[PDB]
Symmetry: C3
Subunit: 225 residues, 3 copies
């Protein structure tokens, strides 16, 4: 069988595009308002939703996908565009909260590299036509746990060391992030991995997560400067 | 119909390759002549024409293209190689003149990111098989205007603030750049966009522009240190 | 004919994967042992064998390759994955020894860029379906010689200037590196270039070289801190 997106998925792509694009314009206003030395979280958060807006437009316009054979015998549309999005946006999301903590660049570096490895191995698993897809998935899950360790140990120490409003903002955003980001490997296991849920279900599920992880998250970042 | 390059286009690729490659060797001599602390514009300008030489060789040797369906029903050879070129060379061209101005890195950053977005969205539009090609094009045109705003407002302020020979060199190069770079979205509208002009006409038109934007421009940069 | 890997090549991929992966875990232990300010060669060497482990897994799992027409009339499986590996790992290998020398960043920059050009032009040659493959190869060989010049002239001067244990370590590693890295364009000439040796012979030959260039080399780096 050929498993591709339905109407419900395409509308979710357009809805999600609109949310990201609106957020991008808003955050551009809010950022270029602020003085040059105060723009860091602005630039980062703007870049997150701008890149996601570009990816969502692409997917809504029937780009950024390729039909890939799953070992169950179906051809499934793999939205490689989402991984390109995540390659830039997930390190940016992490930096948005890591920058609160003042930890050394050396520590931040291995957290973001654990994150890019996570995404890249997911991509490779998604483009695999065979059972070795699951080795990619499992090692990527290990790297996700490296990222979480980074957030809840050295990152957390940094935030508590700074004190003031930093711990509340950091633990609030990091706790939300940590819990939310578990949605992604779950959806992947069900979608690109096992070809169990429909591509519409996949698209809608990743869209909901992306709205939570970028729109909700981003507005929270932007509204607490 | 299948729209591909003719002989006139391939010779223009070889001619343009020769011009870039000659310029690269010359600029390598001129740069490694100069002392380590004086090499910046040298390295940048060398990199521009070296990368363009590699891209032009590739296209002359029948690489860097894929046949893509245009909604008019023709298959058109899209030279994705040129966009890979532009991804590196257009930020480098901008840096070549932005470095004259001493503006903050924060400003330079959003100018180059506006530029990379411009190129990338052009690529996506070029690889699109449907009418959403024009949304890519229009937003990319907006980003081009962001780049020009960067050059003619903060960049321009920086140059005038420095004074001396900087304003004359900056406004001369930036004015030439600004006007010349309008050629690209015009050609694209006629070529990758609408499939209106032949691929030979496309190749020749982008070649002429590239010779002006890199060979002429580069020699002007290199001959005013 | 269709030239693809046999069993001997796939086992060599798994063996090589195991060696890289073991080395990655070991080097992770050794690096996160050391204090934050002493981790540079650790991080670099860890990254080398981690990336190679990912590439070798991919190739062992039948990814990272595409069938490409050689002008001799055969279709040959080109392992583009190896070039993606080399794009990151060969600059990292160079930095691992260049960091001993204290030379200016400006010099290190053109050495690594000569190296990335070398790899990229090899990739382009490998993906070429025609005789222009050899122009890519020859220019890439020139860039290899640029890299070696970098190592044996400014890099070497830096090392001798520092003195102490640096010259012995630098010249030992650089001499080994220089000689060993000649294996790659030889194998390429025989494999991706001319389609003369089998893909199994290719895989085994690049694996042997990679084990020498990353496992042996990496253990030597890690065991001389
Ligand atoms: C910023 C840089 C370093 C990384 C971002 C670019 C990466 C993630 C991009 C660049 C080119 C992309 C690939 C180009 C072409 C295809 C063909 C299709 O059948 C499957 C997806 C696949 C294979 C893409 C996957 C994502 C990709 C690998
Ligand atoms: C330096 C990094 C971050 C960016 C530069 C690399 C980008 C622009 C390159 C990497 C791989 C490239 C893609 C790889 C394969 C194909 C297949 C072809 O049918 C259409 C072009 C397309 C899709 C290429 C377009 C350009 C591309 C996306
Ligand atoms: C870190 C960034 C800047 C560079 C690393 C990414 C580059 C080297 C990667 C990104 C996408 C890759 C390409 C994507 C798709 C294909 C299709 C296949 O038929 C031939 C290989 C080819 C064409 C790949 C070659 C390597 C590639 C170009
Ligand atoms: C048919 C479908 C079935 C496929 C099943 C495969 C699923 C595999 C799941 C993987 C579990 C995650 C493994 C990860 C286990 C932890 C590894 C680790 O070292 O990371 C933590 C530290 O680095 C922190 O410092
Ligand atoms: C059949 C072919 C017809 C297709 C027509 C589509 C062409 C669309 C053209 C686009 C016009 C350019 C829109 C750009 C308008 C300006 C947007 C903007 O905000 O940028 C300026 C500021 O950022 C500066 O600070
Ligand atoms: C059928 C197969 C036959 C194909 C033959 C093609 C092989 C071509 C081989 C290339 C030889 C290498 C050329 C390289 C020659 C040196 C060029 C150079 O300037 O580099 C050195 C300096 O930069 C150092 O500072
Ligand atoms: C700043 C610019 C960086 C943009 C990175 C966005 C990459 C997101 C999606 C890839 C879309 C591929 C779109 C490809 C369209 C071809 C079908
Ligand atoms: C065919 C129709 C099946 C429609 C299935 C629709 C499934 C929607 C799942 C969803 O929206 O989850 C959002 C959360 O992840 C937000 O946190
Ligand atoms: C320094 C090295 C960076 C080189 C970047 C040049 C990329 C330019 C053109 C892509 C050519 C693809 C050439 C692909 C040949 C395969 C047909
Ligand atoms: C088939 C033959 C049609 C040949 C069309 C040849 C069209 C050449 C256009 C050109 O060279 O423009 C150069 C400028 O952009 C430089 O600024
Ligand atoms: C840190 C993460 C960077 C990983 C870079 C490793 C790239 C190595 C090999 C490409 C494998 C492509 C694997 C593609 C699998 C699709 C068949
Ligand atoms: C079919 C069987 C042919 C098997 C050919 C096997 C050829 C193995 C060559 C090799 O392992 O070289 C290693 C060195 O490069 C290490 O420095
Ligand atoms: C805006 C997008 C976000 C926050 C995306 C996050 C994605 C992840 C946390 C993905 C994780 C994955 C794994 C842990 C294993 C398998 C592949 C995944 C990439 C989807
Ligand atoms: C050496 C190459 C140069 C200076 C190339 C410049 C290219 C541009 C200014 C391209 C601009 C584009 C748009 C404004 C919209 C549509 C896509 C374009 C990429 C060709
Ligand atoms: C761990 C991997 C290593 C050290 C790979 C090294 C690869 C090279 C030195 C490759 C060189 C090449 C040329 C000089 C010309 C033709 C293409 C090559 C890429 C294989």
């Amino acid at each position: 069988a050929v498993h591709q997106i339905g109407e419900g998925g395409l509308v979710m792509y357009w809805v999600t595009f609109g949310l990201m694009a609106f957020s991008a314009l808003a955050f551009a206003v809010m950022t270029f308002t602020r003085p040059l030395n105060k723009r860091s979280h602005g630039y980062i958060t703007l870049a997150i939703v701008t890149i996601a807006a570009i990816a969502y437009y692409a997917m809504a316009a029937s780009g950024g996908k390729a039909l890939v054979s799953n070992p169950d015998g179906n051809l499934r549309d793999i939205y490689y565009a989402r991984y390109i999005d995540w390659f830039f946006t997930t390190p940016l999301l992490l930096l948005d909260i890591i920058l609160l903590t003042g930890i050394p660049i050396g520590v931040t570096l291995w957290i973001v590299l654990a994150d890019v490895a996570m995404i890249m191995l997911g991509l490779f698993g998604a483009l695999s036509t065979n059972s070795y897809r699951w080795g990619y998935y499992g090692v990527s899950c290990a790297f996700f746990f490296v990222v979480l360790w980074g957030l809840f140990f050295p990152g957390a120490k940094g935030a508590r060391a700074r004190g003031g409003q930093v711990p509340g903002l950091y633990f609030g955003l990091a706790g939300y992030l940590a819990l939310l980001w578990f949605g992604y490997p779950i959806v992947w296991g069900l979608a690109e991995g096992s070809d169990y849920i429909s591509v519409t279900a996949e698209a809608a599920s990743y869209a909901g997560l992306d709205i939570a992880a970028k729109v909700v998250f981003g507005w929270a970042v932007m509204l607490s400067h």
